[PDB]
Amino acid sequence: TCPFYKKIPGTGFTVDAFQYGVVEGCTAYFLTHFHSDHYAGLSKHFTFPVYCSEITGNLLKNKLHVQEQYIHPLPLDTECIVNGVKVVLLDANHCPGAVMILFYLPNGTVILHTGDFRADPSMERSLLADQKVHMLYLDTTYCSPEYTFPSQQEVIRFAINTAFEAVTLNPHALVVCGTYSIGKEKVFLAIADVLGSKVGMSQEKYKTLQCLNIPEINSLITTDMCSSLVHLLPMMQINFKGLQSHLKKCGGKYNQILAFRPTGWTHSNKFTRIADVIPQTKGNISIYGIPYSEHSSYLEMKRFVQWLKPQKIIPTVNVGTWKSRSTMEKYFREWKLEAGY
Ligand code: NI
Numbered sequence: 001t002c003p004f005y006k007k008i009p010g011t012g013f014t015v016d017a018f019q020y021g022v023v024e025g026c027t028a029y030f031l032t033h034f035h036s037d038h039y040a041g042l043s044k045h046f047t048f049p050v051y052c053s054e055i056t057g058n059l060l061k062n063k064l065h066v067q068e069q070y071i072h073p074l075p076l077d078t079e080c081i082v083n084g085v086k087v088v089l090l091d092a093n094h095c096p097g098a099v100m101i102l103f104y105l106p107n108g109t110v111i112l113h114t115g116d117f118r119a120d121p122s123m124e125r126s127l128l129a130d131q132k133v134h135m136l137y138l139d140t141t142y143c144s145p146e147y148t149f150p151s152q153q154e155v156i157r158f159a160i161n162t163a164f165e166a167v168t169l170n171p172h173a174l175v176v177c178g179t180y181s182i183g184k185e186k187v188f189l190a191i192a193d194v195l196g197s198k199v200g201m202s203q204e205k206y207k208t209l210q211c212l213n214i215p216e217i218n219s220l221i222t223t224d225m226c227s228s229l230v231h232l233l234p235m236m237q238i239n240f241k242g243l244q245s246h247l248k249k250c251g252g253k254y255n256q257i258l259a260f261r262p263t264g265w266t267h268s269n270k271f272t273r274i275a276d277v278i279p280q281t282k283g284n285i286s287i288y289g290i291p292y293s294e295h296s297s298y299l300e301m302k303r304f305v306q307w308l309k310p311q312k313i314i315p316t317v318n319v320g321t322w323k324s325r326s327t328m329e330k331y332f333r334e335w336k337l338e339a340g341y
Contacts, residue, residue, distance in 0.1 A: 005137060005314050008113070010105045011085055015113050015137070018042045027083055032115025033098035034059040035181055046070055051082060053089060055097025058211035059182075077127065090126055092117040094294050095183035096212040102127065112308070113137040114316075119296040119304035128308070136310035140317040141295040143328050147265055148297055150274045155292045156190050158274055159260060162288065163191045166258050167229070173256040175230045176246070178238035182208060183294050184262045189220060191260075192230040200228030226253070235261070240282040247285070256284045262292040302335060309341035 006017040012027030018041035023029075031052045032038055042050070044065040049072055052060065057073035060066040074080050076089050076099065086104035094116040103111040110133050117139050163175050175195070177188040192199045199221050201209070206223045214220070222228055233246060238261050247257055259279075269291055279286040296304065305313070313332050318324040 003319075005316055005319065008103055008111060010107060010109070011103065012083065013085070013103065015101065016115065018046075022048075030101055030113075031056055031060075032092065032101070032113070033095055034063075035095065035116065035183075038115070039064075042066065051087075053097045053099050055212055056099075058213070059097065059208070062211050063208060088127055090123070090128070093120050093123075094118060095181070096185065096214075097182075102133075109134045111135040111137070112310075114139045116141070116294070117296060118294055119300040121303075123304065124307050133308055134311045135314065136305070136308060136312070137314045137316055138301075138305070139295060140301075140315040140319075140328055142265060142293075142298055143301060143315075143318070143331060145298045146270060148299070149265060149269055149291045149293050152186065152292060154274055155290055156186060158277065159187060159290065160190055160194045163230075163258065163260075164194045166256075167195055170256055172254050173258055174247075174250070174254040176238070176243065176257050176259040177230065177232055178235040178259065178261045179205070179232050180235040182212070184292055185209070185212075185214070187260060187262050187290075187292055188230055188232060189214075192220065192228075195229060197229045198222045198227070199230045199232060200225045201232040205232055225250070229254075238287065240285055240287075243285045243287075257286070259285070259287045261287060261289045263289050264293050264295065265291060302331075305332075306335055306339045309339065 002014060002017045002020045002023045006014055008015065012025055013030060014023055014026045015030045016032055016038040017023060018029060018039055028049050028051055031050055034056050042064050046066055047070060049070060050060065051072045051074060054073040057071045060071050061068060074089055076091060080087055088102040089099040090102065092098040092100045092115055098116060100112060100114045100117055110131065112133050114137060166173050175191055188199050201221065201223065203223055206221060209217065209221055225231060238259055243257050243259065266289060277288065277290065279288045315328055
């Protein structure tokens with residue numbers, strides 16, 4: 001049964017609730033972004049409206065095969081009427097096509113649902129700047145002060161440098177990058193760019209990328225592996241047994257792999273900076289973990305919520321245990337008392 005934090009009061013709207021069957025009363029099913037926890041349940045056989053971004057729509061049509069009539073894409077940053085309710089989509093700074101949604105209720109209440117987001121100061125000069133927000137459905141993935149990580153730009157610096165070093169030292173080395181969903185495209189796009197290559201990938205992954213409206217994308221990616229010295233692989237596959245295996249397949253064209261595993265937080269964030277990172281090493285294969293996050297750090301989340309001064313906050317992540325819920329409320333109280341709302 002659909003949980004209360006997936007429903008919007010005073011509407012027939014639900015958010016990211018596709019895995020329950022029909023929700024009685026639900027006229028519209030919003031999808032924040034194309035990640036399988038949030039979309040679990042959609043197929044070709046959905047005959048209710050879905051509202052989502054254009055990019056999310058392309059992925060629904062081409063990867064799950066939903067029928068063009070039932071996909072209502074909406075532009076961002078545009079006041080749009082949806083069954084006589086004003087809504088806006090705003091960029092969530094998560095993965096491609098990920099949005100937050102502003103709901104303007106008839107009674108005067110305003111609700112922001114962040115889906116998955118990485119809070120950023122540029123959001124403070126968006127449409128949100130213009131009016132008060134009474135309720136906040138918040139991505140709480142990293143709502144605990146231990147969760148720090150660097151800026152995406154810091155991380156992209158590290159990567160561009162590492163890769164470019166090795167390839168210039170050894171011109172027969174291959175860069176690999178791990179992946180299992182959309183998100184984090186800037187890692188491989190940046191590396192390839194510095195190396196003067198295209199990124200090479202399987203057919204399915206090429207298909208997923210061609211739906212994302214990246215400009216000039218035809219110049220940046222290929223399905224021809226031979227022709228490319230930045231490869232993508234399944235994140236399952238990024239290990240010594242699977243990388244050795246893959247190094248076979250290239251047929252003596254490269255004598256060294258240098259992989260990157262973009263991860264979120266790991267406990268080695270607690271004691272080690274980005275400029276002081278190292279890889280595991282079993283012979284000629286070197287696997288880097290790099291904490292490129294597409295979720296808010298604790299500080300980033302803290303600032304956003306302290307600027308927004310919501311009258312009420314509804315967690316959407318880590319809500320499944322009483323301890324997590326309790327720990328989160330405490331932080332919400334501190335923020336509110338610090339900030340005087
Ligand atoms: Ni996500």
